[PDB]
Amino acid sequence: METYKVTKTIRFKLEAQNVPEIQKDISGGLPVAKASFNYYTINKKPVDFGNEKSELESRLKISIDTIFKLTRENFSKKIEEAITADIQKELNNGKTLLLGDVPMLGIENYVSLRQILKNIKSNQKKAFSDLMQSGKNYNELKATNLYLLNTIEQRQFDNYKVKTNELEKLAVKINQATNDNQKKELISNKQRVAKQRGIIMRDNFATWKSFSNFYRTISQEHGKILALLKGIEKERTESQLLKYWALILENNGQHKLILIPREKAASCKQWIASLNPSGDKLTKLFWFESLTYRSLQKLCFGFTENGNNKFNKNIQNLLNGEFAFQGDEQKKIKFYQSVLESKYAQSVLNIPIQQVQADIINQSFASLDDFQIALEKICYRLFAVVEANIEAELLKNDKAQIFNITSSDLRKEAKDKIKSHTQIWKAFWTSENKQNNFETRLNPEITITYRQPKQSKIDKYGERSQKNNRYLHAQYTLITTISEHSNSPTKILSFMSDDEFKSSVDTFNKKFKKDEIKFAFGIDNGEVELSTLGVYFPAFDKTTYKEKVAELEKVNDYGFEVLTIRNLNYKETDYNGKERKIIQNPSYFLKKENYLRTFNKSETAYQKMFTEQFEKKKLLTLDLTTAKVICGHIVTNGDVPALFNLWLKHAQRNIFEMNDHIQKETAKKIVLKNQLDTDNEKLKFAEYISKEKEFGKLNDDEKMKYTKWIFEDRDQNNFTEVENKKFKRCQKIYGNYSTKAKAPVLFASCFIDEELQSVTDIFDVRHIFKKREDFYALKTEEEIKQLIDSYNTNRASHDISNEELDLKILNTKKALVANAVGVIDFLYKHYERRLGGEGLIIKEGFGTGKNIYRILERKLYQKFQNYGLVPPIKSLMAVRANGIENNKNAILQLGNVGFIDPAGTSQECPVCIEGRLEHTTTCPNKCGFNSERIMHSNDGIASFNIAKRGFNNFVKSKTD
RNA sequence: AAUUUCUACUGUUGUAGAUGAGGGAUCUCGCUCCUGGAAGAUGGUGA
RNA sequence: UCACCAUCUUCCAGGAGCGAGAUCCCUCCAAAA
Incomplete structure (x- = not known):
């Protein structure tokens, strides 16, 4: 394209x-x-510039009489007079009413409109506040000068006073008996109380509210103009x-x-x-x-109105500014052609006369753009x-x-x-x-x-x-x-309005034909690790289970080749007497050339090495976590250490802030455990991993059942479908902790001064650390535990500030995602070439509404933008909208990229669907499916399912 | 602890990814100090 | 029992100084003795 x-x-x-x-x-x-x-x-x-400041000043010297005409808000004349009367007070001494800026703008005689407005605002609220505290009545209020507020209904304030009263009552409870748990609880309540009070005040007070709007209005212009000034001045380098x-x-x-x-x-x-x-x-x-199209504009016009530009003075006859060319591209193009044609122009503009003549002057163009491109093309x-x-x-x-x-x-x-x-x-x-x-x-x-x-x-x-x-x-x-690709339209979708964008992008989407698609990928949302990947083809949509399984048995026909490391521990010695470990950088053992120059070995040894140290497989899924490309090869376990570093820091940060949680003088004993026993701890944990809004709807038995549904086998704890559905809705962060399954996790509970089995603080160590077999090659678990233990108590170990920590992490994240982008790019090419068609990158629609994932989203997009499979755009994260909810059939399309709903997950079987399933386990319905020789792990089944649904949704999607 | 990328690992000439560059306004939420008011615990004030 | 003083503490409101985050827009080739 x-x-x-x-x-x-x-x-x-x-x-x-x-x-x-x-x-x-x-x-x-x-x-x-x-x-x-x-x-x-x-x-x-630089000297080629005037005193632009003075002109801008003309935009800023507002007078008192015009102020009410600058606002959409409607004010009663009495309120308007009161504002004027207030202003008259402020009208004393200084006369130069201004937006507010550096005194260079308007000299010390200046007074800021914004500030005055902010002043008045503050005074009114303060005055009101103390009236409140004094316990006066409505009549008192009416007798006051609170013009903004005294107009308030008798009814309303009743609420506010009552509410205010509430705060007073609550405050004595906090003055006294100094009990933390309740004091915190009390503080929460008050906070809530204040929340609505603000709501009340904000929303229920027309005069107040209106004025609020008014203030929020005046600030926008000030902000727009201020941006202009800053730009101008910064650009206006007197000595550039x-x-x-x-x-x-x-x-x-x-x-x-x-x-x-x-x-x-x-x-x-x-x-x-x-x-x-x-x-x-x-x-x-x-x-x-x-010479450039953009310069022509600035040559042909601009300062013309100023009486400065001498070019236009000599072509007055040719002409009526740029604006005079309204709704007529033929006018501008011919206007220009004349300009060029103009020998006078030709006497000083350094252009290819002959060339311009032959193609520019001589030829016509369907649209303005065409002209433009040609210009700069030749110029x-x-x-x-x-x-x-x-x-x-x-x-x-x-x-x-x-x-x-x-x-x-x-x-x-x-x-x-x-x-x-x-x-x-x-x-x-x-x-x-x-x-x-x-x-x-x-x-x-x-x-x-x-x-x-x-x-x-x-x-x-x-x-x-x-x-x-x-x-x-x-x-x-x-x-x-x-x-x-300069020699191509500068297509820009950025500046469009609402209805406009949607049309444009849709027109873009029309480029892709439903029959052209041959394959579709899919990206899982799982947070267990980075992510997991899958691919799909339409041919798998057979009519019967036997047909589907038989088709699924053709991995040798459809899958992609892969290399797997046999032994991680493997190491060698070079010609310089130093150990190299394969795991740290496999490339030294892959690219033949390097191997030879390093180890002084013969061709046959290389061949024997290669064959012995590695294995070959073909798969329909992949573990994106560890995946990397080396010399045109796909390796699952290519880079163990990248992950390791990630987790480590992960640990460091969360633990450090736990201790630095203003845990001052209180024996907040941070204890690290491999599991949790008491229900108090378990209940205190499940809360961290669920939406408080939906959490509140569970009863204590449900809370108990939820914990068992988490920390206990679900095949024996016979929960109901509704219970499971409610629990799934309550679930916030997807994960697994089944007993002590093959992904054991730690815990960083924090006892309060002793082993009091009632109250504790437990961040899910899913934010802190997790354990994997592979890591061992690097360091032993005992070494690993010892190291991390340094974090908990060793303050001296924290010799580096956060400013470093954060950027180390951020960059560590970047590195993984970069490896990811490489694999995904490689794959895409492969299939394209292999099948001679274009595919769909379907992603779980995680967005602003609902961290890597955002990153992953972005960088992915850019790798594909150089290919021109997706529209040009402001910024992907400033785009997304609704249409991503409560529909297994929903889909959002941006070129070949697509987002869908997260409903349903790994459990749905590829073949029989309904039967809940686990990888390495046969279908409970005995549909005949097997995952033994088609996937790599449990997560593969999910990434397979997502693409299957995604393609079905895409075909279902109809512009008709 | 060789680097446009020092950004990732290894490591005194490797494997990956890299548009990004600069810059600014608005709005929210956290933490310290100041001024006034609310409100509360003591000891002296008259039964 | 009441006016003020002694003492320490809680709260709200308002002002300043400091820190984090969302959200948006712009920048990145033009002249005459």
Whole structure:
């Protein structure tokens, strides 16, 4: 399908060769210099600007008389007069009524409208509050000046006073007897009490409420204008760093940067243009020139109204501003064509006269866009010169400054696995690009950043350590931005209104035909670990159980190949006398080349190794948790350690905040256990894992049954379907704790000063830690327990702040999701190629309404956006809406992406549906299904079910 | 504890993923200090 | 029994200073001696 004007920021390492001027000025990257490839774009000198402040001031000097006309709210004349009377008080001394800003805006004589409004608001509430506390009556109220409130009904305040009274009563209960449990309880109640009171006040008070709205109104304009000012001022850098003309020099397969002083710029070009156009004399020079549709606009119009722009002065006859071109694309296009056609234009706009003439001037266009694209399409020009001795002449005369561009990839051309970003940069220079009319486009703007090496790793840690690493040094980082598929419509769905968006996206969705679909994936929502994955094909929809099972027996025909690690413990010794462990990075044992260079072994040994250490399988599901791609291979257990780190930190954070829960001076004994015995603990736990709203509807016996339904076998605790359904609805976080099944979990209960079997605080250690077999290879459970035990009491162990903890976690999350995105991308390609069609990525519709999952959602989307299978959009998380509730048939579609309802889960059998089932266990209905040689675990059945339903919903979905 | 990515693991030239860049307004909720009022426990005030 | 003082504490309201989070919009190529 089509492609998009995707924009990608990119960056490279800079090395100083000669910086006579830059070095004069020489935590994170710091801007130091900004430069452009376009000799015209430099000419926007800062001085080329007026005193914009004064004009904006015209928008701000509101008078008292207009204020009531600035609001949608309706006020009784008496209320309006009172506001005016109040304002008259405030009208004293200062006269310049303003929005409110830096005194530079309006001089100290200024008074903020917002503040005055906020003032009055505060005074009224305060006055009212103390009246309340004093215990006066309605008549008292009426005799007061509370214009905002004295209009309040006799009825209403009754409530409020009563309620107020309630707070007083409650307060003495808190003044006295100082019992925590009840005091907390009491505080809760009061909080509630206050909640509704606010509701009451907020909602039931028209004058108050109205005014509230009024204040909430005035602030919006102030906010809109303030954004403008900030933008303007920030952009309006009086001494803006943009002072250099950017050039490109190539030499010996390496590219160099050149920055020229502005003053010298002019003359430079002159000298430049006199040289030969082509050759193979080693040294080469480059520069950019182009004209843009967007610039035409700003050339043809703009300052025109100001009487400044001299271009339009000379073409007045050709014309009536841009706005005059109302509902007529043929007018603008022909207008423009004339402009171009205009020799005068041709005398100063550096354009391909011949080319423009042949295609632009000569031809007509169906729509404005078409014209636009062509313009910039052609306008983009790349110039080259061949001559030796160039750089010294530039240095000798032009006082130029030069930089070197470098990376890991650059410094070895002679290899295959180049990083994805470097392709772009490389591909840019190629002739084929030029042949295609500069498909890939370099924006004419660049950035230079400085980054002081971080102290923390310098002195005693890498410097004195004599390490190989180069973070401790000074660095110059180049920031650039590139385009893809520029020669394509700049389709934007962002700016649409309500009804508009839905139509547009639907039109988009029409691209995909129901018969084209060949396969559909599915992503489970399970929180036991990251997630689980499945795939489906329509052919599985047979008519009878026997047909379905037989079809399901063709995994050799439909499945995907996989490699599995045999022995994790496996390790070797290299040619340098150090142990390598396979588990830590399998690649060293996969890619033949690396193996040889490391271990000095022969081809046959490699072959024997390969065969012995691994296994091959074909499956219809997968464990996404640990999955990674290596050298075009899928491995379940590729990266154990990534998970491990995740959990560990997981543990660290939750435990640390538990102790740091202002647990001051109280012996909140935090005890770590592998299970829970008493009902008090169990009941105190199930609450954490259920919705309080639905929890309150359970009785004590139901609460007891719920705990048994959690911590006890459900095959013997004969709960009813309604009980199960109620429990499922109560369930908040999906999980498993069946007795001590193959995923044992810990617990971090917190006794209160002793083993008092009545009250406790228990975070589900599902937030803290879980145990898996695989980890053992890394560390022994005893070592694992000892380590974590450090957390609970060892305060000194917490030498690092949260600011680090959080970002470590956040980035750890990023890494997993990145591995995930790799596997999913790989798979998609495979099937596509294998079946010659497009598939559907169906995801459990977890959203804002209902953390990784959000992340997973996002990054997934972007990997697919470069493919153009999905619309362009503001931001996925600012899109989603209703239509995702109470329907097993519901579906939301965005391109090939789709969201559905979470009703129903693993239990539904693939074949007989109704029979509850577990992986490795035969169907209770004896339908004939088996999961022995088709899936990997229990979770696989779920991800199979979700796709099955998702595809059925998609076909059911009808635009008809 | 080799990095445009120091972002992941291993590790002085590997496997993956990386648009992102900058920036700002509004609104809520947590924690400290200040001013006034409410309201409460003592000891002196007159039976 | 009542006006004020002594003492310490709870609460609300209002103001300032500090911290976290949702939600939205913009930025990323143009001139004459």
